[PDB]
Design a protein around this nucleic acid. Structure first.
Ligand SMILES: [Mg+2]
Ligand SMILES: [Mg+2]
Ligand SMILES: [Mg+2]
Ligand SMILES: [Mg+2]
Ligand SMILES: [Mg+2]
Ligand SMILES: [Mg+2]
Ligand SMILES: [Mg+2]
Ligand SMILES: [Mg+2]
Ligand SMILES: [Mg+2]
Ligand SMILES: [Mg+2]
Ligand SMILES: [Mg+2]
Ligand SMILES: [Mg+2]
Ligand SMILES: [Mg+2]
Ligand SMILES: [Mg+2]
Ligand SMILES: [Mg+2]
Ligand SMILES: [Mg+2]
Ligand SMILES: [Mg+2]
Ligand SMILES: [Mg+2]
Ligand SMILES: [Mg+2]
Ligand SMILES: [Zn+2]
Lengths: 63, 112, 106, 50, 77
RNA sequence: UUCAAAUGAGAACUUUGAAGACUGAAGUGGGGAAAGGUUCCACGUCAACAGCAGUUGGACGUGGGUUAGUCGAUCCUAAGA
RNA sequence: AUAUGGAUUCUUCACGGUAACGUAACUGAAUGUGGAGACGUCGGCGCGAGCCCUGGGAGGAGUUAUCUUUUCUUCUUAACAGCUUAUCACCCCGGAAUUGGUUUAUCCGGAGAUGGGGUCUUAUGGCUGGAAGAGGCCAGCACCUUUGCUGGCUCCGGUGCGCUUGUGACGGCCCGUGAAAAUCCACAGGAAGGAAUAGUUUUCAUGCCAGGUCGUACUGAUAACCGCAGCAGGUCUCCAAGGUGAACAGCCUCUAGUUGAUAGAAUAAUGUAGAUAAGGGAAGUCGGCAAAAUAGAUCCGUAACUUCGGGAUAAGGAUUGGCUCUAAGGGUCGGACGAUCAACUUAGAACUGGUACGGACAAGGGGAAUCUGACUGUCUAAUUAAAACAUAGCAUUGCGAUGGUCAGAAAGUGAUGUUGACGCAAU
């Protein structure tokens, strides 16, 4: 528990402690899925609330 | 941390030997054998799953009432609503066309 | 929220056998009960009283029977009674001090 | 095997009943020449071969 | 096991021909995480299923116990 | 691997307690298939066997123990016969 | 086998809903038809269950030289039954370019999208019955009792690219498209039978009776099998905790299980197994045989050649601890933002120890060339793993069934052949 608390505070996470690759430690696909879901959730919320119209929503969805 | 065993003498991971872990009122984990899941009945014309029909293993259909195995329509059960509608339309239109063709053939025989 | 909780401890058997001091035990509880992470911060929060057979702790700020048992066992270890006297519960929030099983010498 | 056939189990039962030394009163009979069980079988010495 | 909620249905079940035994069980429970209260379960032993009627009113439960048929064999507690 | 006690004519090797270690969940754990056939368990017990020992044992002697409408076989067919 | 209740009928074999379809029921012989049984592999995504991690409280145990509101541990809920619960799919209204909806993955719509309202499968989950009376954790009774008995608590949460496993909608792949049958249900059809003071309906509920034979102990292996043995060999499969760490690796630990293998005393030479070594660095040897050196991760950078796909981790360089901080990356509710909750990734900056920072474990040496076989693959079990064999590609030959290539003693015999030149057969 003490080591986990230190890691949550940010310790023991340097290059001398990393032994797997960056992809093995955290998948870039997982990161991308999180980010794209966040973007689509925000766009849908704005369109449903009326802060943007549907044409702008479509363009921003494509982007 | 509690590990479980098969409750039958089949030791292999076959399709009929599937288990899940369940906690008993005795406070312990135990294996529980799961039957193979049932498949929804399909339409005889298009092959899609039939709406309103219960999904059971084939022997289990003998234990339920006729409500769970039919719907209140012609071909209810065996065929779906869209296919029944299409065959009704086809029957009526083809019969009308047969009457038309018979009248036309009689007129052509008379004129010829 | 801050509903007052009362814990009672019965020291009657060790007190009557004459190997225990209820006043010393109450003073130890007063000195060592922690509030919000510090000792001696019992201001209008925790009250500890004793009358020779019963020690009563009335608290409104984060006190539990587990903590009371922990402090009583610390006091028993400090007075070297940990191997002979234990902290038992009779009902909810009422406890007693009992001697361990001893066979007569004969 | 645990799931065995009745023929196998019957042969096993006969072998179990045969598994014994001599009765002591055999040795006391007149002109007795049998002094031990020469056909005794043990599970770890001679296999029954079904 | 089945649970019943209709009192007339429970009385009919108690007077059914195959029914011989009933059980009265008392539980101590809490209503909306408040004061303690007394719950009574009447369990009629049928041939195929066991029927349970749950009553949260002590007075109504006592009245139903009084209204139980006399030939029915009742096991209390 | 070690200490003490018990049993015993006899204890490095049996039993219990006290210690130090190991397998480290892809186990030295818990179940099964094939195969074995009573090896399971209790009581008694040491001639032979356990490449030392043995009071111990999968050894020797006498017994006890395997309960199904729902777990399997039984039924179906596969390559085939 | 059967009776009662329920349901249906004088409009005889039910009503409701526009519809998808619903129900406690709601006759059905021949015959035909359909469905289920019934099905590959891989990849990501969603959901569930068990496990993992964690908070409050009520109990028990341990530590207490000093400290720690402390460390560990119990707080559980089966089959079955009722109500309810869904991705997909479908129905009604409506009529779309300023094309919109939408998945991590780009598909869908005048053959009717978006939108609103509905219908269904019940994997699965929730509540209740089962069921607290069980089980678990504690406390208190008399005793030689091989005998009995009393009290309490068993509650409320949180979290995730977690592990295992089940499942759903999908996507990729094939000159490979990845069982049968017993069995069950339904539909189409209507031979027929059935009511007025009386009928019908045992696919609705309840009630009654019955279920034979054989197997069932145990081991499943460094001692229960095979190997002439209680033989370091061989022998199919299920479950599976915590830390470090990319990880079922190595190392340490909890549950469980062992502590077995002839022992005691000394420490000569020579061995078997494992290490270190000044200066030189292959001078050794047929031969760098063997050892040593390298090694994780991050960043900079990487040639000839080439079938343009590779070569490649080419080569060659820099870094890695601890501590104290900073910045960025979200969810749920409300009308420029506010309240609340939570996880592990990355980057940067000070300080600090150092002879060492992938501190044990773990873990490529690299390069310039020649011959040779395209590659992946296969064989001399028990001396040869290769340049040998196979392979895809290429080429030749025979055959149109009264046939080609083969088989059988024969036969009203057989393989290719459930075949037909984009085929089979011989090379
Ligand atoms: Mg990873
Ligand atoms: Mg990618
Ligand atoms: Mg080891
Ligand atoms: Mg270890
Ligand atoms: Mg010997
Ligand atoms: Mg034994
Ligand atoms: Mg014996
Ligand atoms: Mg058994
Ligand atoms: Mg076993
Ligand atoms: Mg053998
Ligand atoms: Mg042999
Ligand atoms: Mg040197
Ligand atoms: Mg030289
Ligand atoms: Mg030389
Ligand atoms: Mg190269
Ligand atoms: Mg080759
Ligand atoms: Mg060889
Ligand atoms: Mg070789
Ligand atoms: Mg070749
Ligand atoms: Zn259809």
């Amino acid at each position: 528990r003490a080591h986990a608390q230190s890691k949550r505070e940010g310790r023991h996470s340097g290059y001398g402690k990393r032994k797997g690759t960056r992809e093995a430690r955290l998948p870039s696909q997982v990161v991308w899925i999180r980010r794209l879901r966040v973007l689509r959730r925000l766009l849908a919320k704005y369109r449903d609330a009326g802060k943007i119209d549907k044409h702008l929503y479509h363009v921003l969805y494509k982007e | 941390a509690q590990r479980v065993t098969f409750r039958r003498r089949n030791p292999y991971n076959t399709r009929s030997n599937k288990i899940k872990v369940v906690k008993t009122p005795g406070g312990i984990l135990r294996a529980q054998h799961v039957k193979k899941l049932a498949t929804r009945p399909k339409c005889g014309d298009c092959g899609s799953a039939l709406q309103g029909i219960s999904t059971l293993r084939p022997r289990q259909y003998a234990t339920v009432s006729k409500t769970h195995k039919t719907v209140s329509r012609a071909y209810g059960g065996s065929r779906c609503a869209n296919c029944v509608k299409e065959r009704i339309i086809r029957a009526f239109l083809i019969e009308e066309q047969k009457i038309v063709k018979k009248v036309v053939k009689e007129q052509t025989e008379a004129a010829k | 929220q801050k509903i007052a909780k009362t814990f009672t401890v019965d020291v009657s058997s060790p007190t009557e056998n004459g190997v225990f001091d209820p006043a010393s035990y109450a003073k130890y509880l007063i000195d060592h009960i922690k509030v919000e992470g510090a000792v001696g911060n019992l201001g209008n929060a925790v009250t500890v009283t004793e009358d020779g057979t019963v020690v009563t702790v009335v608290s409104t700020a984060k006190f539990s029977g587990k903590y009371l048992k922990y402090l009583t066992k610390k006091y028993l270890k400090k007075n070297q009674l940990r191997d002979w006297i234990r902290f038992v519960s009779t009902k909810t929030n009422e406890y007693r001090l009992a001697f361990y099983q001893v066979t007569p010498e004969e | 095997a645990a799931q065995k056939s009745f023929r196998i189990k019957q042969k096993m039962a006969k072998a179990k009943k045969q598994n014994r030394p001599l009765p002591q009163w055999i040795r006391l009979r007149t002109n007795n020449t049998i002094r031990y069980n020469a056909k005794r079988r043990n599970w770890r010495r001679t296999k029954m071969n079904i | 096991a089945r649970e019943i909620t209709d009192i007339k249905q429970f009385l009919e079940l108690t007077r059914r021909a195959d029914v011989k035994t009933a059980t009265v069980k008392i539980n101590k429970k809490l209503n909306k995480a408040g004061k303690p209260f007394r719950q009574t379960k009447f369990k009629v032993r049928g041939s195929s299923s066991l029927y349970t009627l749950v009553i949260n009113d002590a007075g109504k439960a006592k009245k139903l116990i009084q209204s139980l048929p006399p030939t029915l064999k009742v096991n209390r507690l």
